[PDB]
Write a protein that binds this DNA or RNA. Structure first.
Lengths: 110, 46, 56
RNA sequence: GGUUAAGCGACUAAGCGUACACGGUGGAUGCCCUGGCAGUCAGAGGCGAUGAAGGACGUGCUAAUCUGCGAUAAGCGUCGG
RNA sequence: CCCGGCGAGGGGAGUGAAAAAGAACCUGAAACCGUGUACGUACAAGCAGUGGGAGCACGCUUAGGCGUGUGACUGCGUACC
RNA sequence: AGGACCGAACCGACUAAUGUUGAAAAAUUAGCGGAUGACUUGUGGCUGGGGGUGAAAGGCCAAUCAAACCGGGAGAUAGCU
RNA sequence: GUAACGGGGCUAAACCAUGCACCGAAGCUGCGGCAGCGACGCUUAUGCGUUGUUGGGUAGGGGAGCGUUCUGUAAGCCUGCGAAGGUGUGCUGUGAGGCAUGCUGGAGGUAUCAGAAGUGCGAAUGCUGACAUAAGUAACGAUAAAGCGGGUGAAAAGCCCGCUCGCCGGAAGACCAAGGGUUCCUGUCCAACGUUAAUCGGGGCAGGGUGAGUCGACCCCUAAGGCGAGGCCGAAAGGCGU
RNA sequence: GACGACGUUGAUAGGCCGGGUGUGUAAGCGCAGCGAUGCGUUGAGCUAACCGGUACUAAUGAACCGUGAGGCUUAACCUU
């Protein structure tokens, strides 16, 4: 069996979150938890909460074994960008793109 | 830098107010055009 | 000052070939509490080499 | 079989490319119309000092807005349906 | 019910013909950004394709030597308006 | 006494550097000039576009001036791109 | 930068003469196929037995067609036993295209022959929206300056408390007008707003708060100036003015 | 980034000890002077990056990566 967890409309650009996602792809959840805890980065705080949700789902819904689990798939998709205005010099206006991300994590007992 | 808009409600109402518009033939035509267009704020009164 | 042609997805990814992060492969483990942490750093509970350094 | 020498020689992918599959973003396309456009046949062609047009402020068991109403204030009387 | 900050956001459950119709909601195209698989790519120079073409992978096949994807190497080749 | 002198406020803007997708659609920093006067400033008022005002530069008249802005004639005309 | 055979190299692989071979184009021929114009058998309600020949093409002329939306044919036909649209596959035509079908989709679509057009886009420094690029780069707005402890909290360099440090002090303090109009206080919340985080905020939500015979306005009085009964003037509008 | 040294079997850095260097006679006390000051204690006190030493502090036991005899053909050698 496999489980899924997602965090949609996250306040971070996918490019920044993908750096952390590449560290735990194909790792034991236990090993991935330790990699995110001691990773001095913000996206790691978000990914760790998505992973933790996947663990809880399996133990609750599927009553799975924790140690027998491990990450299977993880990907960060681009989310809706929020349009803002940044006043520049000489009356010119630039548009800020506060990018968002959709984080997804998958675990399995395979 | 000293900009163009130096607000003064007195000068605002005396220059573009309702009674200032109703005091001339052409000022009354301004209100007629704004009434025909459907403006919610005919003037700068309040 | 500015580009004459739009760079490609390839050059973009090629430039990001060195932007990947590294993960600490190992973590310290005290023989007193058994809890693991970074090396040359202190644990959460505070134990350190079986001397009970700062607790509170 | 063993050693040496010469010659040849795949397995690597940090990343990238093409294809396919699965997705995200985005809101095109199709479908829909209590909205518009242009007309036809009928009407009515004026409102106003008996205070107009258009507004302000109010008005509810009501915090806001819209609609209606005007301190008799989402309504009063009467005659009919 | 569960993770989470008595959050956001999700996973189940349940409603429903449909939740991949969950309100950021019919259909959900393209640019654009990604995950996975196959092949190719770290001694090779240029409108990036075209003709030839090995090898690999996959699907066929009453072995039928064909198809699909990839494209080492090689001839020619300086976009459109 | 002084359109007197030195010099803050205040009013100005001679030089240099910085800034030049600026902190700023003309500023900052260090110096500079005037500083009882033809000074400066608040409030209100008047002058309206071939017109105003101008110790006069074609200067200013709402970041727009060798004829303001808005609307209209108007889909001006364009033997040119 | 060899740089005056394209190069390597050549004493012939140079030059002259002669001769026989071969390579060599979308030229010619061969094989198959399409189309146009011609003559032919009055052939035949015209296709050929055949027949010759032609077929590079801008401006431009002529001819013949595809497809799109709408009207009639159509209360017909297809369609929840799955329409349009979307996405693939396969077949097919000289081409614009067409047919079938898997998945998606969940309700309209439309033959044929005619008819009418907002009928076909890569360009116009085209218009609108969306999304890239540069790039996770510049920058985060005065070089007045922060440090520690404790508290709160999911989380504290930025909030609260406290001890120090530093800055303004003819202000970077205090009270007003103008202007703004609830930004004031309390509680609560952190999505967005704050160029970072945020428990904080001039942010969100809710509630509360502005008490005058003496302050100010209104009021009385007038300045500049404005309006202006009559009036004077002026095509009208209107202008000046008692 | 890299490069070099060291990581307790240890002088890598800091501190500490001593020295040197620089500054130029600290503070306090006492004496003299009405006093400012001067004199004595005293070339004093302080002294950064330097020199020579010193495990007082920090450089932790581990863990992680990297493997397990290294292709085919041919020739000469082992077996001139």
């Amino acid at each position: 069996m496999e489980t899924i967890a997602k965090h949609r409309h996250a306040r971070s650009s996918a490019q920044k979150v993908r750096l952390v996602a590449d560290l735990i792809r194909g790792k034991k959840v236990s090993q991935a938890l330790d990699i995110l805890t001691y990773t001095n980065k913000k996206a790691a705080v978000l990914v760790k909460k998505v992973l933790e949700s996947a663990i809880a789902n399996a133990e609750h819904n599927d009553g799975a074994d924790i140690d027998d689990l491990k990450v299977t798939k993880i990907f960060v998709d681009e989310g809706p960008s929020m349009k803002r205005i940044m006043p520049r010099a000489k009356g010119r206006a630039d548009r800020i793109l506060k990018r968002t991300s959709h984080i997804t994590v998958v675990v399995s007992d395979r | 830098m000293k900009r163009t808009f130096q607000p003064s409600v007195l000068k605002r109402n005396r220059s573009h107010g309702f009674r200032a518009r109703m005091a001339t033939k052409n000022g009354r035509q301004v209100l007629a055009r704004r009434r025909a267009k459907g403006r919610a704020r005919l003037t700068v009164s309040k | 000052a500015v580009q004459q042609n739009k760079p490609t997805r390839s050059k973009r990814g090629m430039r990001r070939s060195h932007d990947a992060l590294t993960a600490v492969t190992s973590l310290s483990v005290d023989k007193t509490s058994g809890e693991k942490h970074l090396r040359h750093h202190i644990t959460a509970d505070g134990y350190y080499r079986g001397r009970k350094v700062i607790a509170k």
